[PDB]
């Protein structure tokens, strides 16, 4: 029972935004670390719901700062294949392994739920300061894979932060996105838009606007 050691494998999902926009390229990434100089050859086998595919691209060996090798294989996935819950398996073979290592990843299971998006103006207590906070409340979505952005007048906003998805009591997720703008931009009536991308939305997106207009 003395065959411990050898490389390790980590399998990563595609970015949520790449699976939702048909123009982008969603990819699953199989990363092999702790590859020795004595046994540097790594072999990748890719499977989609059990059947093998051969279109993945393997990057050449790259020596890390700890004198080990790191080998990465990238598999382009079809947008609807990932969204429909297909399983992606990476099988890694190397002479230093007693048996190939298999890692499987797929989208979180469960019925998708449409997010509700609400924009909230700054609190009147914050108007005394030089920069105000614009809030985008996104709640009730499942799975937690989502992308949130801000823009105004056809240009992205350069100063916003979004909290991680938080599990709500009903099994769905929620988050908040805080856009920080100069108070003058807000009081001058500029229109700011919160764009939310999620598979449960029509055309995989919705956007809600926010502007100073009590008068």
């Amino acid at each position: 029972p003395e065959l411990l050691g050898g490389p390790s494998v980590f399998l990563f999902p595609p970015k949520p935004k790449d699976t939702l926009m048909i123009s982008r390229t969603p990819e699953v990434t199989c990363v092999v670390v702790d590859v020795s100089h004595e046994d540097p050859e790594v072999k990748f086998n890719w499977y989609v719901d059990g059947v093998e595919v051969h279109n993945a691209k393997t990057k050449p060996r790259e020596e890390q700062y700890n004198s080990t090798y790191r080998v990465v294989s990238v598999l382009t996935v079809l947008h609807q294949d990932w969204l429909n819950g297909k399983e992606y398996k990476c099988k890694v073979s190397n002479k230093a392994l007693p048996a190939p290592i298999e890692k499987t990843i797929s989208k979180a299971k469960g019925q998708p739920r449409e997010p509700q998006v609400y924009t909230l103006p700054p609190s009147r207590d914050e108007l005394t300061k030089n920069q105000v906070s614009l809030t985008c409340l996104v709640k009730g979505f499942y799975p937690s894979d989502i992308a949130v952005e801000w823009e105004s007048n056809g240009q992205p906003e350069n100063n916003y932060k979004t909290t991680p998805p938080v599990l709500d009591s009903d099994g769905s997720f929620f988050l908040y996105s805080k856009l920080t703008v100069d108070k003058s931009r807000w009081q001058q009536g500029n229109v700011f838009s919160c764009s939310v991308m999620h598979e449960a939305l029509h055309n995989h997106y919705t956007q809600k606007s926010l502007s100073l207009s009590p008068g």
């Binding site: 050898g6 702790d34 100089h37 700062y65 700890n66």
Partner: peptide
């Protein structure tokens, strides 16, 4: 297993 030898904070050799 998976031993690293270090010189001046940097690992220069790796053994499974």
């Amino acid at each position: 297993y998976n031993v690293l030898y270090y010189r001046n904070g940097k690992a220069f050799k790796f053994f499974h």
